[PDB]
Amino acid sequence: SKYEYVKLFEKENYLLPDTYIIIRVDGKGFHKFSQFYEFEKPNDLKALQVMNSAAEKLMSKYSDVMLAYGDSDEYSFLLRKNCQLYERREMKLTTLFSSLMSTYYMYFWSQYFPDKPLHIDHLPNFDARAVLYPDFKHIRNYFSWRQVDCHINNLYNTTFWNLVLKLKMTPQQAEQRLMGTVASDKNEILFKECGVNYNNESEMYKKGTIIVREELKIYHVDIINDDSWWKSRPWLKD
Amino acid sequence: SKYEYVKLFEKENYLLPDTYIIIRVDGKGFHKFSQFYEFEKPNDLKALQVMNSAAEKLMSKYSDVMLAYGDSDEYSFLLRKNCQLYERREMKLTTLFSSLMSTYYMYFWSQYFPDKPLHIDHLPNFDARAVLYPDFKHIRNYFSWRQVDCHINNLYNTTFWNLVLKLKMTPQQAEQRLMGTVASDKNEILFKECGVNYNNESEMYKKGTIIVREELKIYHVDIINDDSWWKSRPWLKD
Amino acid sequence: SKYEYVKLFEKENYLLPDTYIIIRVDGKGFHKFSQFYEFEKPNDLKALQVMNSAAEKLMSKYSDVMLAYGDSDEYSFLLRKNCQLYERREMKLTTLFSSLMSTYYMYFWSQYFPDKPLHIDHLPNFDARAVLYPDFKHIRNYFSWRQVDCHINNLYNTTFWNLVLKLKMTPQQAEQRLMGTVASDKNEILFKECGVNYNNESEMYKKGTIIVREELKIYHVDIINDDSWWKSRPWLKD
Amino acid sequence: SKYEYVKLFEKENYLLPDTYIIIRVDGKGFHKFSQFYEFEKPNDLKALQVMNSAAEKLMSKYSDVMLAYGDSDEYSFLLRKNCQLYERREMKLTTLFSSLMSTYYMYFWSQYFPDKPLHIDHLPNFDARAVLYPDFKHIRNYFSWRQVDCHINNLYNTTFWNLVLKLKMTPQQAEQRLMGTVASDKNEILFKECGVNYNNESEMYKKGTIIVREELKIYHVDIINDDSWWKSRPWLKD
RNA sequence: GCGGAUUUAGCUCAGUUGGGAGAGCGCCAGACUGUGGAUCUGGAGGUCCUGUGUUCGAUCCACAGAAUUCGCAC
RNA sequence: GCGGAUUUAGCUCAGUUGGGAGAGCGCCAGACUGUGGAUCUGGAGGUCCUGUGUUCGAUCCACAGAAUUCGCA
């Protein structure tokens, strides 16, 4: 053909071999999304169950995924360093992960929320980015970063939404009240003013969600300081 | 934070400025997809209408998309050379496009096919790639390439399936019949042996689908040799 | 062989076809270099001829180089859109250009300065970077940028070195004297305090060096506003 | 400035952190270079001493280089995984290495060969590529690969040049003679026909050259199987 | 895109309805001698592409995903 | 992750009910002049981060998405 020459303008990027690959997918404008479909605040259980369902099915579909961690509207997938999926073409991996997460989310939404059919202008869309890590310690520190982020965001949102619902404050009022406040102050505000003991909050909300290949098992525990949890799973390293 | 340092391992790729951008999305294993949901052969109208609906909605959402061409399980989107969407980040554009096409396809499928609800193991997924073209002549030639490819492939499937249906041949028999045949030979085989006049086939089947920003208008015309069609639409160039 | 596998960690980068290529080479620490070998200030003529000789020879060797502009310790080379040199492999182009400029500079230095044999710890080194530009207008604007920067740096160096040499100021003293000063002030300082008419300085010093493929001709002219200079050379565009 | 905007078209590439970097430089058309300056065959000691001098000086100039291995017209440099030279910018590293190796080669050439002044059309140029390796085992395997390649190439050149020089053959005759020949066949040809025992060849010629930071020490030993050679130098991993 | 064929040790290839994995070259060690060549002896290396399903048991059987190659076709 | 402020001519800052965009500099040319200095005239360059609407009309207003910067950690 006299037209195929344009194919020469395409440029592929193969991700460095024998390197750990993290693919992180993130909900596009899921704040507005959470508002449109009237999500429970601070945390809506079933929506998180949809997220976990999509992630788990995806994980079941692709064996190279050793571990997955999700919270709020985000999910991180760890691919074994020796992954050869799609010859490690970055675009294939990221666009496939985003496509899969979006479609599976739509499906499981149709399963968990039949009362709230999806509207064409507020469909769940995900972006996806690939990140390379040469040593496992960086993987540990990454998931540590994500879990710390989950802890901070959950504490803030629980305090905020308890201030809004129980103390009937305005979002602006709750926002100003939390200004310059630290973890101890948020816990004290929740317990004394809202009558809520944070430590008694669901483990899933405060710790996020971990899916690990054992069998596929789901945990909601601290992985930041618990070295034995990692050490007992050496196949994560391989 | 002692963990945020891992964020430094990320690499962004900004697409060269003042360049025409083509993002092509492609259905993942849609032959098998067409089999599972028992698509009509050679061409199933309603499915193609799902594709076109999804693509048109997508084009409607992003004003930077000047032109789209789709056929079978593929769709190409032209973004104007001075586009600043997501600061011209390749990953954002591609993962977002795959996600959008996927979700819109899922939505419109429930609309056109209420009789065939989607199965979790056969959801429509799309990959996506970004290609840069510095001169409009290469864009013209690109879409020319896509239309020629559509013509050849359609001619193949229509001839094959007419050989299976009208002459009651076995797939291997029809395939053996098509060895060393060219477009003209396939046309002559269809007309003389199967009694089907190709030129009378649906225009969408023979030319594919064009969505162009005018209002958004859909065409099923030749864009390869019709220079005036392009010349009459200078806003495509800039 | 059981060791050849490491070849898979290599990454090639082919520069986008049908795009103008600019390769800019720049002297490594040529201020300290100028100090060690006792360069005349503000401008040492013979050094500039070494630069120009190296650039001209390099350009003579590779016909794809259509235009070159050099000043101080930098030089810019324009390679035509359909250049296929080293299959447009970026790395080959850049390392080759840097190696060539360094070696030719060493050679022509050995020719112009036999009195000052080069010392191993002060050899002329060059870096090299490649930049892609999709439209010729951006090429014009690039070389315009380079000539403007050349004017700025030359004016600064002449004023600075006239304040240090013609007067008896310290380099830091002159630096502080020129702080927050503009072209008008520099001109006025040269005139009133140093008794130097900037405009009467050599044209090469104020405008830089242009090498054009016509035959290779060397110019010291304005290319910023002179449209006719470019328009009279359409082969530069092709 | 209204022209500085072109600066936005540059794209820099920062190498993945915590990864071992190998920068390999290789002589451009050094077959022709070897012919032009009438190099001794198969191996010219003084030329190898020029290469080695250049490499040692370069390594001496940049403390980040932990190990270097060179042979024939190529040299490989290992940079420790946490190196921050030029912020791990690929272009700067490679073009700088090419420039340095080229200039140093010119200088030491002027020192070892006062009898053979360099001709402008045959100055020594080097290309350079950077390769990332996430694990040290790959470093060991890389240098192993290069040393094996050295063994093969040296055996070939010694057998070949003994066939042209000693048996007074034409290069094409030797080329055809070595077609389909294996190491054993080459050894027997040298031994029986040329009266040459390969094992008695200089250790530098058959093993290549190793420069290691200990002090900078030079070795001509096997590094493929001698694990202790690496193990006794743990600072290479760090 | 359509179809066939293939994926097991470092390289080339076996193998068994469906049962516990091998040979030649190459590599390392020792003896031997002409040396890293020749012969001989010894030894090392493998997620049998990645998952799933059935089964007491999968390299094999069924399905799916990835990769290699050759045909036909622009 | 949560919030404040910011993005307007090449640079630096105003900036407006909601209506018609500017200054200093920079920069091109011309007259006279020490020089493309100053001084003098004319002129250019602004998609005011990007889209939609309310409107007879949008730089400010209302919705959506993005970027720089500093806090709270």
PDB file of N, CA and C in Angstrom, chain C residues 180-238:
ATOM      1  N   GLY C 180      20.953  44.847  36.938  1.00  0.00           N
ATOM      2  CA  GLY C 180      19.683  45.505  36.697  1.00  0.00           C
ATOM      3  C   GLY C 180      19.769  46.552  35.609  1.00  0.00           C
ATOM      4  N   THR C 181      20.871  46.529  34.870  1.00  0.00           N
ATOM      5  CA  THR C 181      21.088  47.469  33.785  1.00  0.00           C
ATOM      6  C   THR C 181      20.556  46.890  32.470  1.00  0.00           C
ATOM      7  N   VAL C 182      20.043  47.761  31.607  1.00  0.00           N
ATOM      8  CA  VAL C 182      19.519  47.345  30.309  1.00  0.00           C
ATOM      9  C   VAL C 182      20.420  47.822  29.172  1.00  0.00           C
ATOM     10  N   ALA C 183      20.136  47.339  27.963  1.00  0.00           N
ATOM     11  CA  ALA C 183      20.913  47.648  26.758  1.00  0.00           C
ATOM     12  C   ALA C 183      21.272  49.127  26.617  1.00  0.00           C
ATOM     13  N   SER C 184      20.307  49.996  26.895  1.00  0.00           N
ATOM     14  CA  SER C 184      20.516  51.434  26.797  1.00  0.00           C
ATOM     15  C   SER C 184      21.597  51.887  27.774  1.00  0.00           C
ATOM     16  N   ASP C 185      21.520  51.353  28.989  1.00  0.00           N
ATOM     17  CA  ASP C 185      22.483  51.653  30.040  1.00  0.00           C
ATOM     18  C   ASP C 185      23.864  51.108  29.715  1.00  0.00           C
ATOM     19  N   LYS C 186      23.927  49.905  29.151  1.00  0.00           N
ATOM     20  CA  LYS C 186      25.208  49.321  28.758  1.00  0.00           C
ATOM     21  C   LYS C 186      25.873  50.140  27.664  1.00  0.00           C
ATOM     22  N   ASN C 187      25.069  50.568  26.696  1.00  0.00           N
ATOM     23  CA  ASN C 187      25.575  51.379  25.604  1.00  0.00           C
ATOM     24  C   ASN C 187      26.108  52.698  26.139  1.00  0.00           C
ATOM     25  N   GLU C 188      25.329  53.306  27.028  1.00  0.00           N
ATOM     26  CA  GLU C 188      25.686  54.587  27.621  1.00  0.00           C
ATOM     27  C   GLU C 188      26.931  54.494  28.513  1.00  0.00           C
ATOM     28  N   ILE C 189      27.062  53.400  29.259  1.00  0.00           N
ATOM     29  CA  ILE C 189      28.256  53.141  30.068  1.00  0.00           C
ATOM     30  C   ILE C 189      29.495  52.974  29.197  1.00  0.00           C
ATOM     31  N   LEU C 190      29.364  52.202  28.120  1.00  0.00           N
ATOM     32  CA  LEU C 190      30.478  52.000  27.194  1.00  0.00           C
ATOM     33  C   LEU C 190      30.922  53.346  26.624  1.00  0.00           C
ATOM     34  N   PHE C 191      29.947  54.138  26.188  1.00  0.00           N
ATOM     35  CA  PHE C 191      30.209  55.441  25.580  1.00  0.00           C
ATOM     36  C   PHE C 191      30.801  56.486  26.523  1.00  0.00           C
ATOM     37  N   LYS C 192      30.095  56.767  27.610  1.00  0.00           N
ATOM     38  CA  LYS C 192      30.504  57.802  28.547  1.00  0.00           C
ATOM     39  C   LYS C 192      31.722  57.396  29.368  1.00  0.00           C
ATOM     40  N   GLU C 193      31.728  56.159  29.853  1.00  0.00           N
ATOM     41  CA  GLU C 193      32.768  55.717  30.773  1.00  0.00           C
ATOM     42  C   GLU C 193      33.941  54.998  30.109  1.00  0.00           C
ATOM     43  N   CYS C 194      33.684  54.244  29.044  1.00  0.00           N
ATOM     44  CA  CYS C 194      34.767  53.493  28.418  1.00  0.00           C
ATOM     45  C   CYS C 194      35.206  54.107  27.090  1.00  0.00           C
ATOM     46  N   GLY C 195      34.382  54.991  26.536  1.00  0.00           N
ATOM     47  CA  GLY C 195      34.703  55.621  25.268  1.00  0.00           C
ATOM     48  C   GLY C 195      34.696  54.621  24.128  1.00  0.00           C
ATOM     49  N   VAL C 196      33.764  53.676  24.182  1.00  0.00           N
ATOM     50  CA  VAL C 196      33.668  52.638  23.164  1.00  0.00           C
ATOM     51  C   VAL C 196      32.323  52.656  22.447  1.00  0.00           C
ATOM     52  N   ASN C 197      32.364  52.734  21.121  1.00  0.00           N
ATOM     53  CA  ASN C 197      31.152  52.659  20.317  1.00  0.00           C
ATOM     54  C   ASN C 197      30.892  51.200  19.963  1.00  0.00           C
ATOM     55  N   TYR C 198      29.869  50.630  20.590  1.00  0.00           N
ATOM     56  CA  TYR C 198      29.519  49.225  20.415  1.00  0.00           C
ATOM     57  C   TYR C 198      29.257  48.869  18.951  1.00  0.00           C
ATOM     58  N   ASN C 199      28.527  49.728  18.247  1.00  0.00           N
ATOM     59  CA  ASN C 199      28.175  49.468  16.851  1.00  0.00           C
ATOM     60  C   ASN C 199      29.388  49.312  15.922  1.00  0.00           C
ATOM     61  N   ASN C 200      30.527  49.880  16.316  1.00  0.00           N
ATOM     62  CA  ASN C 200      31.741  49.807  15.504  1.00  0.00           C
ATOM     63  C   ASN C 200      32.541  48.541  15.752  1.00  0.00           C
ATOM     64  N   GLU C 201      32.073  47.739  16.703  1.00  0.00           N
ATOM     65  CA  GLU C 201      32.672  46.443  16.983  1.00  0.00           C
ATOM     66  C   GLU C 201      32.483  45.558  15.756  1.00  0.00           C
ATOM     67  N   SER C 202      33.362  44.574  15.583  1.00  0.00           N
ATOM     68  CA  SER C 202      33.268  43.644  14.461  1.00  0.00           C
ATOM     69  C   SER C 202      31.859  43.054  14.327  1.00  0.00           C
ATOM     70  N   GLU C 203      31.368  42.971  13.090  1.00  0.00           N
ATOM     71  CA  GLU C 203      30.034  42.437  12.802  1.00  0.00           C
ATOM     72  C   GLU C 203      29.875  40.995  13.271  1.00  0.00           C
ATOM     73  N   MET C 204      30.964  40.238  13.194  1.00  0.00           N
ATOM     74  CA  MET C 204      30.983  38.855  13.649  1.00  0.00           C
ATOM     75  C   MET C 204      30.697  38.758  15.143  1.00  0.00           C
ATOM     76  N   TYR C 205      31.234  39.703  15.904  1.00  0.00           N
ATOM     77  CA  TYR C 205      31.068  39.701  17.353  1.00  0.00           C
ATOM     78  C   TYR C 205      29.625  39.993  17.762  1.00  0.00           C
ATOM     79  N   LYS C 206      28.994  40.933  17.062  1.00  0.00           N
ATOM     80  CA  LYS C 206      27.653  41.405  17.411  1.00  0.00           C
ATOM     81  C   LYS C 206      26.517  40.590  16.803  1.00  0.00           C
ATOM     82  N   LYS C 207      26.787  39.921  15.687  1.00  0.00           N
ATOM     83  CA  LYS C 207      25.733  39.207  14.972  1.00  0.00           C
ATOM     84  C   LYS C 207      25.930  37.690  14.936  1.00  0.00           C
ATOM     85  N   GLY C 208      27.145  37.239  15.237  1.00  0.00           N
ATOM     86  CA  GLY C 208      27.478  35.826  15.191  1.00  0.00           C
ATOM     87  C   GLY C 208      27.945  35.319  13.838  1.00  0.00           C
ATOM     88  N   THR C 209      27.941  33.997  13.675  1.00  0.00           N
ATOM     89  CA  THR C 209      28.447  33.360  12.462  1.00  0.00           C
ATOM     90  C   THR C 209      27.373  32.508  11.800  1.00  0.00           C
ATOM     91  N   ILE C 210      27.139  32.727  10.511  1.00  0.00           N
ATOM     92  CA  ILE C 210      26.185  31.907   9.766  1.00  0.00           C
ATOM     93  C   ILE C 210      26.875  31.118   8.644  1.00  0.00           C
ATOM     94  N   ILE C 211      26.691  29.803   8.609  1.00  0.00           N
ATOM     95  CA  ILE C 211      27.189  28.981   7.508  1.00  0.00           C
ATOM     96  C   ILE C 211      26.028  28.405   6.706  1.00  0.00           C
ATOM     97  N   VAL C 212      25.953  28.741   5.422  1.00  0.00           N
ATOM     98  CA  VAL C 212      24.836  28.289   4.606  1.00  0.00           C
ATOM     99  C   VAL C 212      25.284  27.468   3.410  1.00  0.00           C
ATOM    100  N   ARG C 213      24.541  26.404   3.135  1.00  0.00           N
ATOM    101  CA  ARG C 213      24.745  25.609   1.937  1.00  0.00           C
ATOM    102  C   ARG C 213      24.073  26.319   0.763  1.00  0.00           C
ATOM    103  N   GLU C 214      24.862  26.744  -0.219  1.00  0.00           N
ATOM    104  CA  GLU C 214      24.323  27.502  -1.347  1.00  0.00           C
ATOM    105  C   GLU C 214      24.241  26.664  -2.618  1.00  0.00           C
ATOM    106  N   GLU C 215      27.630  24.983  -2.462  1.00  0.00           N
ATOM    107  CA  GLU C 215      28.681  25.805  -1.867  1.00  0.00           C
ATOM    108  C   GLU C 215      28.370  26.224  -0.428  1.00  0.00           C
ATOM    109  N   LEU C 216      29.413  26.353   0.388  1.00  0.00           N
ATOM    110  CA  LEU C 216      29.260  26.818   1.766  1.00  0.00           C
ATOM    111  C   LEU C 216      29.734  28.252   1.945  1.00  0.00           C
ATOM    112  N   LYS C 217      28.812  29.157   2.263  1.00  0.00           N
ATOM    113  CA  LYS C 217      29.155  30.567   2.450  1.00  0.00           C
ATOM    114  C   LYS C 217      28.978  31.027   3.896  1.00  0.00           C
ATOM    115  N   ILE C 218      29.917  31.846   4.368  1.00  0.00           N
ATOM    116  CA  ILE C 218      29.883  32.369   5.731  1.00  0.00           C
ATOM    117  C   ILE C 218      29.416  33.826   5.756  1.00  0.00           C
ATOM    118  N   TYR C 219      28.443  34.112   6.614  1.00  0.00           N
ATOM    119  CA  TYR C 219      27.849  35.435   6.742  1.00  0.00           C
ATOM    120  C   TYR C 219      27.892  35.949   8.178  1.00  0.00           C
ATOM    121  N   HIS C 220      27.829  37.270   8.319  1.00  0.00           N
ATOM    122  CA  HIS C 220      27.692  37.914   9.620  1.00  0.00           C
ATOM    123  C   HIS C 220      26.594  38.965   9.531  1.00  0.00           C
ATOM    124  N   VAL C 221      25.371  38.513   9.274  1.00  0.00           N
ATOM    125  CA  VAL C 221      24.264  39.418   8.993  1.00  0.00           C
ATOM    126  C   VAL C 221      23.065  39.189   9.899  1.00  0.00           C
ATOM    127  N   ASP C 222      22.125  40.126   9.864  1.00  0.00           N
ATOM    128  CA  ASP C 222      20.878  39.965  10.593  1.00  0.00           C
ATOM    129  C   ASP C 222      19.978  38.978   9.862  1.00  0.00           C
ATOM    130  N   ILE C 223      19.473  37.989  10.594  1.00  0.00           N
ATOM    131  CA  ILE C 223      18.562  36.992  10.036  1.00  0.00           C
ATOM    132  C   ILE C 223      17.220  37.015  10.759  1.00  0.00           C
ATOM    133  N   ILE C 224      17.136  37.849  11.791  1.00  0.00           N
ATOM    134  CA  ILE C 224      15.926  37.973  12.597  1.00  0.00           C
ATOM    135  C   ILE C 224      14.769  38.607  11.831  1.00  0.00           C
ATOM    136  N   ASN C 225      15.008  39.793  11.280  1.00  0.00           N
ATOM    137  CA  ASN C 225      13.963  40.559  10.603  1.00  0.00           C
ATOM    138  C   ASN C 225      14.037  40.486   9.078  1.00  0.00           C
ATOM    139  N   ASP C 226      15.186  40.067   8.560  1.00  0.00           N
ATOM    140  CA  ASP C 226      15.399  40.002   7.118  1.00  0.00           C
ATOM    141  C   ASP C 226      14.707  38.796   6.487  1.00  0.00           C
ATOM    142  N   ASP C 227      13.426  38.951   6.164  1.00  0.00           N
ATOM    143  CA  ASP C 227      12.636  37.876   5.567  1.00  0.00           C
ATOM    144  C   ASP C 227      13.182  37.424   4.214  1.00  0.00           C
ATOM    145  N   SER C 228      13.701  38.382   3.452  1.00  0.00           N
ATOM    146  CA  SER C 228      14.216  38.113   2.114  1.00  0.00           C
ATOM    147  C   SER C 228      15.412  37.162   2.134  1.00  0.00           C
ATOM    148  N   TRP C 229      16.192  37.215   3.210  1.00  0.00           N
ATOM    149  CA  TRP C 229      17.351  36.344   3.365  1.00  0.00           C
ATOM    150  C   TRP C 229      16.937  34.875   3.378  1.00  0.00           C
ATOM    151  N   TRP C 230      15.825  34.594   4.049  1.00  0.00           N
ATOM    152  CA  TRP C 230      15.283  33.242   4.141  1.00  0.00           C
ATOM    153  C   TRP C 230      14.516  32.826   2.894  1.00  0.00           C
ATOM    154  N   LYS C 231      13.609  33.695   2.459  1.00  0.00           N
ATOM    155  CA  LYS C 231      12.771  33.443   1.289  1.00  0.00           C
ATOM    156  C   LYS C 231      13.618  33.195   0.021  1.00  0.00           C
ATOM    157  N   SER C 232      14.782  33.838  -0.058  1.00  0.00           N
ATOM    158  CA  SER C 232      15.687  33.652  -1.197  1.00  0.00           C
ATOM    159  C   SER C 232      16.406  32.304  -1.136  1.00  0.00           C
ATOM    160  N   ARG C 233      16.216  31.596  -0.027  1.00  0.00           N
ATOM    161  CA  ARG C 233      16.809  30.277   0.165  1.00  0.00           C
ATOM    162  C   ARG C 233      15.757  29.223   0.516  1.00  0.00           C
ATOM    163  N   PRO C 234      14.875  28.887  -0.442  1.00  0.00           N
ATOM    164  CA  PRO C 234      13.785  27.942  -0.174  1.00  0.00           C
ATOM    165  C   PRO C 234      14.259  26.509   0.054  1.00  0.00           C
ATOM    166  N   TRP C 235      15.458  26.176  -0.419  1.00  0.00           N
ATOM    167  CA  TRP C 235      15.980  24.827  -0.241  1.00  0.00           C
ATOM    168  C   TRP C 235      16.259  24.510   1.229  1.00  0.00           C
ATOM    169  N   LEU C 236      16.325  25.547   2.055  1.00  0.00           N
ATOM    170  CA  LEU C 236      16.475  25.371   3.494  1.00  0.00           C
ATOM    171  C   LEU C 236      15.223  24.727   4.085  1.00  0.00           C
ATOM    172  N   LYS C 237      14.076  25.089   3.522  1.00  0.00           N
ATOM    173  CA  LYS C 237      12.769  24.588   3.947  1.00  0.00           C
ATOM    174  C   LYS C 237      12.522  23.136   3.536  1.00  0.00           C
ATOM    175  N   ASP C 238      13.266  22.659   2.542  1.00  0.00           N
ATOM    176  CA  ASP C 238      13.021  21.336   1.975  1.00  0.00           C
ATOM    177  C   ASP C 238      14.181  20.399   2.285  1.00  0.00           C
TER     178      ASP C 238
END
